[PDB]
Every structure is written in C-alpha cells, then in structure tokens.
Design a protein around this ligand. Sequence first.
Ligand SMILES: [Cl-]
Ligand SMILES: [Cl-]
Ligand SMILES: [Kr]
Ligand SMILES: [Kr]
Ligand SMILES: [Kr]
Length: 162
Amino acid sequence: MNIFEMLRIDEGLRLKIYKDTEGYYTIGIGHLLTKSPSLNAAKSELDKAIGRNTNGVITKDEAEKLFNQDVDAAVRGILRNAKLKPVYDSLDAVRRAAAINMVFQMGETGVAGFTNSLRMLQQKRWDEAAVNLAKSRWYNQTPNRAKRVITTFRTGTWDAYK
Ligand SMILES: [Cl-]
Ligand SMILES: [Cl-]
Ligand SMILES: [Kr]
Ligand SMILES: [Kr]
Ligand SMILES: [Kr]
C-alpha cells in the first residue's frame, strides 16, 4: 500500500464529470473542478486543466496525470504550511499518508483547522487523537472514509485498507 493506492480506493476513478459527495463537479480520481453549480463552468475548467477540448470526458491516462499533480500539490501544501509541517515531519511514513489523504480531501486550510487533533498527533497520543478527529463534520458526512483514515492514524498500519 501507498498514498496513491490509498486515495485511489477512497476516491474511485470516473472518466466523465460527476458530482462529488458535496454536489461539486469533479472528474477522475477526486479532482475537484469547480464549486460552481454550472456544468459549463466545470467543462471550462476541465479543458483548461487538460489542455484540449474534452467535451467532459477524459482518458485513464489524463485522470492519472491530474492525480499525480494533485498528490504532489497536497504534499507541497503541507510542507509549506506552518501549522502542518511540524506535525507531518513528526510522523512515521504510514501516518503521513493519512495526513496527505485528509489534505487532498479537505484542503490545507481545512486540515489546519483541526488544532486540537494536530497537537495530539504531534504528541503521539493516538487513541486520544482518533477520538477528537471523529468529533467533526468530516466524520459525520463521510463516516466510512473518515473511519479508514482515523484507524490509519490510530494504528500506524494499513489494516483499514486491507
Ligand atoms: Cl489543474
Ligand atoms: Cl465515506
Ligand atoms: Kr499534518
Ligand atoms: Kr493531519
Ligand atoms: Kr489532523
């Protein structure tokens, strides 16, 4: 297991524009296109991201290309964020994949808002952090995915994905 395989399980792969769990236009492996309710706007952003007139449809390869860019951006976002970097650097490799997952889902900002949990993770208080992490809109809205990520921080193993 690794970060790619992990997010590929949590996000799925769809070659035509679809709405995600929040009703926003997305494509591929969880690539958010726009929060706008306009399909045309979505189609606009997709073409711009791909570099061709796609007509709302992309290939497997193109999806994978966006995904790689998205994972890279997520990592870079963490490393550049002053509240996140220290936590991430204190973690082992598995737990770091959990942190990248959360960032890919909710954005750096979002994650940077879990103050209390960030601190517990940094102190290595796993059980305590897992309980605090569950007290969130994130967990109530996508509970099965949240449970998988939380178990990953809790145990430091890939069992929830096995
Ligand atoms: Cl892009
Ligand atoms: Cl879920
Ligand atoms: Kr983090
Ligand atoms: Kr995190
Ligand atoms: Kr977090």
